[PDB]
Structure 1
């Protein structure tokens, strides 16, 4: 079956603003995760056709990935840090839901998530 359209990264009817926390999420958080050796499966949407996973989009109803997050940060899609953090969390949770504990893909997601949480603990104050 065909892949769904990817999550939107532009919508003029969505409100948005720049905040120092959103700048940090791009310049520090995304940047650090993007270059991790285990980033590559998370850098674009799951292509279930390419991966031959007929069931993926029956199980994962709210797909998210770092390619989408990157474009949302770069294109000023977000209103606040919480919206972006939620996208990261959806990405990690989808991987844990779809796959099994201890699978390679899960260990990769877990390594990224550990870093992610280190980085979010250093989220600057809104200023």
Structure 2
């Protein structure tokens, strides 16, 4: 069994900027979720090999996780807040698509997503 390569976190071909919204995404949004008691399954790519989930990457063709997001923020990968917000939504959506209501991982995702929603509701106006 094999995992795919992780999503990229560096690409000199990609355009990027450092903005007040992206700073908020790191300092407020990512930090809040990262510290949460239920963050840990989401802090790195799903290891479908060790977890014995051989169909994971058959169903999830756009993997995303907060370790990748953290690196993207820290390594100034993004052009705008929407690109980052999309990554968070992909991560949550992947969990809901793969799993079933009431599963522990879904409950965990839902807790993180509640906080995500509240933080992004106060994303500052661009400077």
TM-score, normalised with respect to structure 2: 0.99
The separation in 2 between residues aligned to 1:54 and 1:118, in whole angstroms, is: 34
Give CA-to-partner distance per residue, 1:21-62, whole Å, 9 cap, x none.
000000110001000000000000000001001100000000
The match for 2:81 is 81
Report how far residue 98 of structure 1 moved. Answer: 0.3
Report how far residue 110 of structure 1 moved. Answer: 0.3
Report how far residue 65 of structure 1 moved. Answer: 0.0
Superposed counterparts of 1:1-20, under 5 Å? 1-20=1-20
Cα RMSD between the aligned structures? 0.4
Deviation >4 Å, runs of 4+: none
The unaligned stretches of length 5 or more in structure 1 are: none
The separation in 1 between residues aligned to 2:24 and 2:75, in whole angstroms, is: 15
Determine whether 1:56 maps to 2:79: no
The separation in 1 between residues aligned to 2:54 and 2:83, in whole angstroms, is: 29
- Residues matched between the structures, number: 127
The separation in 2 between residues aligned to 1:2 and 1:8, in whole angstroms, is: 18
The unaligned stretches of length 5 or more in structure 2 are: none
